[PDB]
Each structure stands twice: as C-alpha cells, then as structure tokens.
Amino acid sequence: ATYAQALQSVPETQVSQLDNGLRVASEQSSQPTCTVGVWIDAGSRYETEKNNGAGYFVEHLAFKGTKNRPGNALEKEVESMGAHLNAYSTREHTAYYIKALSKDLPKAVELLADIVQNCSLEDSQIEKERDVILQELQENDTSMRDVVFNYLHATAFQGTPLAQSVEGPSENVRKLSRADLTEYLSRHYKAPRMVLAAAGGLEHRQLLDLAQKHFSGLSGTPTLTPCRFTGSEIRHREDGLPLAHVAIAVEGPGWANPDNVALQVANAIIGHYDCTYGGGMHLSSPLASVAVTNKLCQSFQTFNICYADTGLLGAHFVCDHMSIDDMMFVLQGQWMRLCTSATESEVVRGKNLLRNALVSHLDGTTPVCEDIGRSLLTYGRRIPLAEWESRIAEVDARVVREVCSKYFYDQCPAVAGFGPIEQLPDYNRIRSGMFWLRF
Amino acid sequence: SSKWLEGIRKWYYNAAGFNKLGLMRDDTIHENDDVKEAIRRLPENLYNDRVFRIKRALDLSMRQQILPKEQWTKYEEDKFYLEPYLKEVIRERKEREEWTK
Amino acid sequence: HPQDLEFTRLPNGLVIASLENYAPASRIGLFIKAGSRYENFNNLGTSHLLRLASSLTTKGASSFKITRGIEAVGGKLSVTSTRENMAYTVECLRDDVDILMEFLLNVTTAPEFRRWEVAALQSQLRIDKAVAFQNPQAHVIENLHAAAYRNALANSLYCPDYRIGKVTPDELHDYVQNHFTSARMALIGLGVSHPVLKQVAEQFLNIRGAKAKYRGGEIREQNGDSLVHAALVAESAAIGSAEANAFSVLQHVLGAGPHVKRGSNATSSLYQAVAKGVHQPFDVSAFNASYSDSGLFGFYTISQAASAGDVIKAAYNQVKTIAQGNLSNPDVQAAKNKLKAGYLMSVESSEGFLDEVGCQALAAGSYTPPSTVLQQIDAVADADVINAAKKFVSGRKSMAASGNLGHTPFIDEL
C-alpha cells in the first residue's frame, strides 16, 4: 500500500442538511464506539461589551438542569449508560460532545438535544455558578500561558470584539442576571450555525433519522465584520516570578487560503521544543540546535491560529530572564532565513512533518469529530486528506519564500510579555530586527 | 625498502626533539574545536598523565634544560592514544558536512 | 475488512503480532520486560538513564544520523515505561517503515553508551525529574509504592536524588546484556504485514527476577502546600484473574475520574458519602494499580489542610459498609457498563490500542480478543465484589500522605 492506496481508502464524511439549516455529518469506521456532538459557531466574538462571558456561563449551566430531566437526572442517565461528556468554548466555536458507546445512540441524541434547546435557569444554580466562575477566574489567573495568549489577543485586536476574553471580565461576571442569559440563548443557537457531528461506529441513516426526530421544533429563523490587527506591545512586568513568558504574533491569512498551507509548512519547520526532549544538540530545527547549544530557553512553540478571515502567525517562548534578547534575535534570524534564502531540502522536511503531524492527529474518534465540526463550520465542507496531499504537492521552496516574504517580513508585531521582562527589547528594536538590510 | 622507511621515521623522531623533554606523540597536538572535543572525550588517568607531562615540559623549557638521556621516551614505546577519539571527531565533522550538503 | 490481527511466537522466544488495517499511519511497538521492577539495590536509576538514552550512538549508526534521519522521515520515536515494561514506539507514514525499523533495531540491539553522552544525560535526568515532580500526584504515588512493598515493586520510576551522576556505562552494559533477551520481547505492528516483521525479527535480533512481598507501612511528607494528599492502599490481587476483574468492578462502584466535566458525580458513592459528611472543596477517587505478582487497591483523596481526617474516616466507613453487604445490583450493572465503556474506549486511538495489545500479548504470552473480554467483564458476580471489599478490609493497610499533615490519622485512627 502507498499514499494513493492509503488515501483513496478512507471514510467519506457523508453530510446532509435538515430543513432548518441544521448541518448534520457522519463518518463511519469499524471500531465499536461513537463520538456525537453539537458544534456551534457562536462564542465570545458575537458578544458585545455588556454581555461578555455569557458563553462560558452557558457551557457551565448546560448540564445543571433541563426541563424534562431536572438537575441531576441528566448526569444520572449519562453515567448510568456509562459515557463521557465534555464541552468547551473558544472565542468563536463552542462544542458539546459525548464520547459514548455504540448501542447508546438514540439516548445520546435525545439527551444532547435536551442540553442544547431546553436549558433551565434556576436562581440557586445561577448563584452557585456565579461563585464557581469567579473562583475559576482566580484559578486561571495562575496559569501563565493562558494569561499570555489573552494578553496577545487583547493587544492584537484592540477595540474589536475579538479582544474579549472567553470568560469575560470579572465585574461583567458578577453582574449578569438571568434575563441577559435567556436573551443570549434565544439569539445565537438557531438555524445554520450548528452541526450535529458523529464519528465512529454508527450508521448515517440512523443518525439522520434521530436528528430528524429530536431536533424538530427547534425552528430557527447578521454579524461577522472584519477585524483590525493593530500590532503593539503589552508588557506586564512582575519581577517575583522564576520564568519569562513572551509571545509574539504577526497577522495570519485566515481559513480560506492556500497560504494557510504554506504557513503550516513554515511553522512545521520552526515548530516546537521543550526542555524534557530526548536528543538535544542534533535536532533538525536550527533554532532548537542553537537553543540547546547555548541553553537559552526552556521551551517554545511556534504556531498558527486562524479565525474567520483573520489570524495570528505566532511564536511563544518560555525562557529565563537573562536571555530574552538572545532568543529574540535567533528567532527573528530564523524567520528571515526562511523568508529570503530557504532551500528545498528543509521545505521537504517541513512537508514530511506536516504530513506526519496531520495524519497522526486525525486519528481515533475525538480529533476526527472535532475536525468534522470545525471543518463544516469554517470551510463549509470537510476536506478529504487526498486534497491536502494535492495542496502539499503544489508547494515548493519558491511559494514558501514568497508567502513568508509576504507575511513575516516587515510587519508590525503584537508582542505580549509577562514576568521578568526587563531585557525584552523596546518595540523599535523588534522592528529593526524584523526586516533585513542583510543586517 | 621496508626498514629504510622505518629508518627515516625513527631518525625524524630522534631529531624532532620533543622526545628529549619527556613527551609522547600526542602531547604536542594543535588545537581547534575538533581536538578540544577529543581532549574533552578522554578518560581520567590518561588526562592526568597528559597534564603532568605538559607541566614537566613547560618547567624544563622554563629553565631550558633537557632531561637526562635515560628518561627520553623513545620510539615504539609511546602511546598513540588520542588517535581513535580524534578519528571519531573528524568522522562526525565530515558526517555533518556531507549530510547537510 | 478481510484482515484480523495475526499472532506468532517465534521459538527462539519472542512474539510477533500485527494488525494490517488500511490506516495511513504505521506504528511499530517493541515491548520489553525491563521496567523498574527488575533492578536491585545497587543500580537504581539505571532504568531512567536507559529511558533517556534513545538517541545515543549505536553499533552501525551515530547519534546525528539517527536524530536527523528520524526527523527527516518525521516519525515519532517515543519511550514509555511502566514498572514492568519499557516500550519503544516508533510511528510514521507507511512509506518509511523500513528505515525506522532499522533505527529501532539499532537502538535496541546495538548498544554502545559512551561516557560523555552519559554525563550530559545525567544533567538531562535531573531536569526531567524536576519537570515530572512538579505534580504532587507523582510524588504521592511513588511514596505509595515505596511504602507498600519491601521489594522489587518499591523501585522508583525516576532516578533518586543522590544517584544522579554516579551511574556509569558499566552498569548500562550489564543491565542491557541481562535484561534484553529474545524471550522478553513483543514486536507489535499496526499497519504493517506479518512477514515483514518476521523477516526483521528473524534476521536481526538473535540474543538468547524475584517476586515482591507485601510490606505494610506509611510515608508522610511535610510540604506545606495547603492541599493534603492522602492515599490509603491495601494489597488486593495479581493481574489476569477474575479476582482482579472484581476489584475493577469495585473501583467503578466506589468512584473514578469525572465522566461529566464540571459535574457533581452523583453516580459515584464515595463522593456522595464525603459530601454528606464534609462541606468543603475536596476530591476522592479510587485507585486500582495492577502488576504481575501483586497489585494495589485503595483510595486517593485531595483535601484542604483542616479536615482531611473527616474525609478519610467517611470514605473508610463507606468502603466498610459496602464490604459488610450493602449495595444494589443495578449499581453493579452501572459499574459494569462504565467498565465496558472504559475498556472499549481506551483502545480507540493508536497508542492505547498498541499498549493494550502489546502488554496483553507479552504478559500472558497469548492474545485475547476484545469481545470475550467484554463477556468476562459481564460474567463477574456480586458475591465476588463483596468478597473483594472484605479482602480490602481484612488486609493490612498502607498509607502515603503529603502536605500540611496536622490533622491526618495514621493507622489506628482511620
């Protein structure tokens, strides 16, 4: 078997549309398990200034009492049939998904529609979850990485709704009453913006029939402006911490470009290193080789994040307070080396890393069904991986260096620093290190 | 033919002069990053004998006096010890070059 | 799907198994009985230094060529270790199985371990131990397995404080030569064919301790981190038997990890008992660890520094009153559905399936299909559950606790 063999033989992701704009999607395989969820294209981007945090609030309250199954009957029936249940909400997307057993398909679909469209709001529950969400705000204040990415979004999209954090500010947490939450629920979750995704050992006919049964009566019947990528520098100096956390991003292309595939090849070249890895001095990234040779940083991950027709092309390193500038210089040197004179062999290494990471990621049930949700919301169609192989074969060194000269080279970064960052350069030193006069 | 070459090599080793100061063949090696790597990869007792022979050689060139005749390290009793370490260092350097080419 | 899994013990001693599916990712697992339990009191931390030594030079391939070739085909070479087993798992796309097969053979059966790389790897050992024990759970479980066995299960996953730097390649050669034999090896393939693995292991391997007693005891740690951790653990059962299956049923009766995120865990009984007793931010879970000769069953609690004692007393009285004959058979069926779900959904993805199939083939020397495993989980009876809880009660305890230990019972005051 080869790539034509292993890529032709793939399940097919049969999709359909129920007559409410309800986008339903299934994928079948031979293992006896299922992953069934509702992906919803409504997060914190759609929330205004006074209603920040209601989405995170909903995904807290979505398991705490429906009308037909009250407060503990939902969790009792779920853990009585023996299934896992999970939910999250980013700044755009929100997912409720059940990892369940194959013979529990109709009960899972019934409980999932009851979670979606019939959430009760008892005021005892709103008091409990107000206290719990304030305590989780104070918990997530400690994890430095999420503080850094919230800094990075809040300084890269200054003023737009995209700078709103997921949980929202705390005074906007302790003041939301029930009526605003009911208005939120009755506005966002209606007609086209929800996908019933189902991966694993199920039947597409049964899944379509159960959607047709339970999501009847949902009866769904005006946003998404472009956003401003400002580019700035925020620093939160705190000298009582052992590590410096620095993220830096420029603007990425978005969801709908082949330039996204090109920058995925580039960030597969630059990529990730951590302090616990095996084999230090001989790694393929020159950045990682220098950073082990001189012991600059503890870790970095250099990456891409795409939002609806925008995105950050980012790099985030956790390093000691004595070598921020050296790590910064070597990072911008590697960016400009890929921008100007990147040869063919390292592009081939990037294509191999992209293929291996993509295929090894889309394996199992849960990443497959996550891919179905985010692929029907953002694109409009789930791309089979043969087409990703085609768009990898449409990439040589020339397209990579032209697109990296289009995006990395000579832009205004968003720099976000947290910790002991005195040796972090001032913003014009980042600019004079960004472009080349060939230095 | 055979021993004529051996006569050349033994005569050149007598007329070199470092054998008269208590040195062996691999105590007068030029240092680049390769030979610094090879010195770093040595064992302990040979490294201690290396720094002791070097320190005696620097003393006996400090007062510029050559050792008495009986303590000169003759040919074919010296250790050619650094050769496999330095050989592996040069092989790895050429391996990096011809892999990245 | 015309290809089910294939299984063949080559009579030099080793086990080759495979599963040819049409999945584009190819995995090669190589499972070795060389974990921490095969050490003595003189080469501690040789397992850990051996674990961090994947990328050293082999007889036939230097370390630069190994690292750059593996990352040129972009396969993941990972080394995972439990107290019984080490596991060299190398995965990639199916067009580059042969070169990674060769590097796998190199790292296994061409060991060199030169000295300067060993020193750099000592520094790597210390940093890895720090990153590992920034979690409290690892230190609690390591004091747990140190306080419940006098013998080979009391060997740590990690190298201790003082042996960092004083482990030499002599002990590395010794441990490799007498714990990597041709009978203690399971070569598992996912996505490859059986005759290719037969060629590999038939051509290129050709090479050719003591049971653990129960001890009973306690280990406490004054750490002052305002979260008392406490594990109360008694000897339960060896692996393989329906006795161990009954203890698995018992831990799903008592309480496991949270199935519902940000939930209340109203099916778990221990959480309801302690929540009736105590009104705090707390956590109680069960703990079933299983090994070849023995195994541990107990519970594992995280509480505030004030009232850990009330938590542990309430949980202990709950386990006693389940042991004295007070439970419901629909609760047993809910426990069995949880166990069926846990076993069928621990083998969905690649690495979990590889680990399950490889340990299952290596330990008992033979494979068992998943459907009859579900049938045997169904066949466990209720008097077995009551007798397993009675065996937990009537056995000697063992306790490991960490944190601000001002209000923790020791043995008698449980």
SS3 track for chain C = CCCCCEEEECCCCCEEEEECCCCCEEEEEEEECCCHHHCCCCCCCHHHHHHCCCCCCECCECHHHHHHHHHHHCCEEEEEECCCCEEEEEEEEHHHHHHHHHHHHHHHHCECCCHHHHHHHHHHHHHHHHHHCCCHHHHHHHHHHHHCECCHHHCCCCCCCCCCCCCCHHHHHHHHHCCCCCCCEEEEEECCCHHHHHHHHHHCCCCCCCCCCECCCEEEEECCCCCEEEEEEEECCCCCCHHHHHHHHHHHHHCCCCCECCCCCCCCHHHHHHHHHCCCCCEEEEEEEECCCCEEEEEEEEECCCCHHHHHHHHHHHHHHHHCCCCCHHHHHHHHHHHHHHHHCCCCCHHHHHHHHHHHHHHCCCCCCHHHHHHHHHCCCHHHHHHHHHHHHHCCCCEEEEECCCCCCCCCCC
Strand A194-200 to A22-27 pairing? parallel
Task: Please name the helix (run of DSSP H) or strand (run of DSSP E) that holds residue A85, with its range, or none.
Answer: strand A84-89
Q: Is C412 in contact with C316 (CB distance < 8 Å)?
A: no
The residue assigned the tokens 């960092």 is C164
Q: What is the token pair recorded at A201?
A: 């050992």
Cα separation of C387 and C288, whole Å? 16
The residue assigned the tokens 């040789």 is C46
Q: What SS3 class is residue A312?
A: strand
Cα separation of A277 and A293, whole Å? 14
Other Cβ atoms closer than 10 A to A20? 18
Axis crossing angle, helix C194-203 with helix C97-109, rounded to the nearest 10: 30
Q: Give the minimum alpha-carbon distance from C372 to chain A in angstroms, rounded to a whole number.
A: 14
Other Cβ atoms closer than 10 A to C257? 10
Using CB atoms, pick whichever of B41, B92, B99 lies closest to residue C68: B99
Cα separation of B81 and B27, whole Å? 10
Using CB atoms, pick whichever of B40, B41, B92 lies closest to residue C62: B92
The residue assigned the tokens 């350097």 is B93
Q: What is the token pair recorded at B51?
A: 């720094």
Q: Is A215 in contact with A22 (CB distance < 8 Å)?
A: yes
C206 burial (CB, 10 Å; 0-12 / 13-18 / 19+) is exposed
Listing from the earlier edge strand, what are the strands of the sheet with C283-290? C218-222, C399-403, C228-235, C295-303, C283-290
Cα separation of C245 and B84, whole Å? 58
- Report the largest interatomic distance among the alpha carbons of chain A, rounded to a whole angstrom: 69
Chains that touch A (3 or more CB pairs under 8 A): C
Q: Is C117 in contact with C56 (CB distance < 8 Å)?
A: yes
Residue A88 phi, psi dihedral angles, 5° rounding: -155, 170
Cα separation of C37 and C31, whole Å? 15
Pairwise CB contact (< 8 Å): B96 & C64: yes
Residue C185 phi, psi dihedral angles, 5° rounding: -135, 130
Cα separation of A344 and A355, whole Å? 17
Q: Is the Cβ of B99 closer than 8 Å to some Cβ of chain C?
A: yes
Listing from the earlier edge strand, what are the strands of the sheet with A22-27? A14-18, A22-27, A194-200, A34-40, A94-100, A84-89
Contacts with A6 (C-beta within 8 Å, 6 or more apart), sequence order: C22, C23, C24, C93, C94
Give CA separation, C399 vs A322, C142, C205, in Å. Answer: 43, 12, 44
Residue A119 phi, psi dihedral angles, 5° rounding: -80, 120
Contacts with A64 (C-beta within 8 Å, 6 or more apart), sequence order: A71, A125, A128, A129
Listing from the earlier edge strand, what are the strands of the sheet with A271-273? A233-237, A414-419, A244-251, A310-319, A297-307, A271-273
Residue B84 phi, psi dihedral angles, 5° rounding: -70, -35
Q: What SS3 class is residue A126?
A: helix
Cα separation of A106 and A112, whole Å? 10
Cα separation of C73 and A351, whole Å? 10
Task: Please name the helix (run of DSSP H) or strand (run of DSSP E) that holds residue A369, with its range, or none.
Answer: helix A366-377
Amino acid found at A307: Y
Cα separation of A98 and A74, whole Å? 13
| Paired strand residues for C79 | C88
Q: Is the Cβ of B98 closer than 8 Å to some Cβ of chain C?
A: no
Closest residue by Cα to residue C192 from C113, C274, C95: C95
Q: Is B76 left (phi over 0), alpha (psi -120 to 50) or beta?
A: left
Strand C283-290 to C295-303 pairing? antiparallel
Q: Give the minimum alpha-carbon distance from C116 to chain B in angstroms, rounded to a whole number.
A: 6
Residues of B whose CB is below 8 A from C64: 92, 95-96, 99
Task: Please name the helix (run of DSSP H) or strand (run of DSSP E) that holds residue A153, with its range, or none.
Answer: helix A144-156
Strand A34-40 to C228-235 pairing? unpaired
Other Cβ atoms closer than 10 A to C260? 20
Strand C218-222 to C76-81 pairing? unpaired
Cα separation of A348 and A334, whole Å? 17
Using CB atoms, pick whichever of C259, C262, C345 lies closest to residue A79: C259
Q: Is A277 in contact with A266 (CB distance < 8 Å)?
A: no
Other Cβ atoms closer than 10 A to A140? 14
Residues of A whose CB is below 8 A from C92: 356
Task: Please name the helix (run of DSSP H) or strand (run of DSSP E) that holds residue A78, with its range, or none.
Answer: helix A73-81
Contacts with A31 (C-beta within 8 Å, 6 or more apart), sequence order: A200, A201, A365, C348
C9 burial (CB, 10 Å; 0-12 / 13-18 / 19+) is middle
3-state secondary structure string, A189-202?
CCCCCEEEEEEECC
Task: Please name the helix (run of DSSP H) or strand (run of DSSP E) that holds residue B25, with its range, or none.
Answer: none
To the query of whether residue A171 is one of the catalytic residues in this protein, the response is no
Q: Give the minimum alpha-carbon distance from B41 to chain C in angstroms, rounded to a whole number.
A: 6
Q: What SS3 class is residue A331?
A: helix
Residues 344-363 of C with CB under 8 A from A: 344-345, 348-350
Cα separation of C69 and C328, whole Å? 58
Method by which this entry was solved: cryo-EM
Residues of C whose CB is below 8 A from B96: 64
Closest residue by Cα to residue A240 from A321, A317, A318: A321
Closest residue by Cα to residue A416 from A236, A240, A238: A236
Strand C185-190 to C25-32 pairing? antiparallel
Cα separation of A87 and B91, whole Å? 55
Strand C399-403 to C15-19 pairing? unpaired
Alpha carbon A58 to its chain's center: 19
Strand A233-237 to A414-419 pairing? parallel
| Paired strand residues for C297 | C234, C288
Residues of B whose CB is below 8 A from C65: 95, 99
Ordered alpha helix ranges (H), B17-100: 33-40, 44-62, 83-100
Residue C198 phi, psi dihedral angles, 5° rounding: -65, -40
Counting every residue written for chain A, the total comes to 439
Cα separation of C154 and C143, whole Å? 9
Strand C218-222 to C399-403 pairing? parallel
Cα separation of B25 and A214, whole Å? 89
Nearest-10 Cα torsion for C224, C228, C231, C232: 110
Pairwise CB contact (< 8 Å): B96 & C65: no
Closest residue by Cα to residue C399 from C226, C228, C148: C148
Other Cβ atoms closer than 10 A to C204? 15
Q: What is the token pair recorded at C341?
A: 């779900």
Closest residue by Cα to residue A287 from A246, A326, A344: A326
Cα separation of C94 and C91, whole Å? 9
Cα separation of A369 and A84, whole Å? 15
Pairwise CB contact (< 8 Å): A278 & C79: yes
Closest residue by Cα to residue A382 from A395, A373, A392: A373
Q: What is the token pair recorded at A214?
A: 């339970």
Using CB atoms, pick whichever of C64, C68, C116 lies closest to residue B41: C116
Amino acid found at A277: Y
Q: What is the token pair recorded at A16?
A: 């359909």
Q: Is C323 in contact with C394 (CB distance < 8 Å)?
A: no
Q: What SS3 class is residue A3?
A: helix
Cα separation of C361 and C33, whole Å? 12
Residues of A whose CB is below 8 A from C74: 349, 352-353, 355-357
Structure resolution in Å? 3.9
Cα separation of A193 and A220, whole Å? 10
Cα separation of A294 and A316, whole Å? 19
DSSP for residue A92: S
Cα separation of A47 and A169, whole Å? 13
Q: Is C409 in contact with C312 (CB distance < 8 Å)?
A: yes
With CA atoms as reference, the chain C residue closest to A88 would be: C261
Positions of E strands within A260-413: 271-273, 297-307, 310-319
Other Cβ atoms closer than 10 A to A31? 17
Chains that touch B (3 or more CB pairs under 8 A): C
Q: Is A195 left (phi over 0), alpha (psi -120 to 50) or beta?
A: beta
Give CA separation, C44 vs A264, C52, C107, C162, in Å. Answer: 44, 14, 22, 10
Q: What is the token pair recorded at A228?
A: 């401003």
| Active-site option among A27, A47, A59, A233 | A59
Residue A28 phi, psi dihedral angles, 5° rounding: -110, 145
Q: Give the minimum alpha-carbon distance from B26 to chain C in angstroms, rounded to a whole number.
A: 21
Using CB atoms, pick whichever of C52, C95, C260 lies closest to residue A278: C52
Q: Is A232 in contact with A286 (CB distance < 8 Å)?
A: no
With CA atoms as reference, the chain A residue closest to C69 would be: A284
Cα separation of C311 and A18, whole Å? 51
Cα separation of A163 and A306, whole Å? 15
With CA atoms as reference, the chain A residue closest to C55 would be: A279
Task: Please name the helix (run of DSSP H) or strand (run of DSSP E) that holds residue B81, with its range, or none.
Answer: none
Cα separation of C388 and C400, whole Å? 22
Contacts with A224 (C-beta within 8 Å, 6 or more apart), sequence order: A308
Q: Is the Cβ of C371 closer than 8 Å to some Cβ of chain A?
A: no
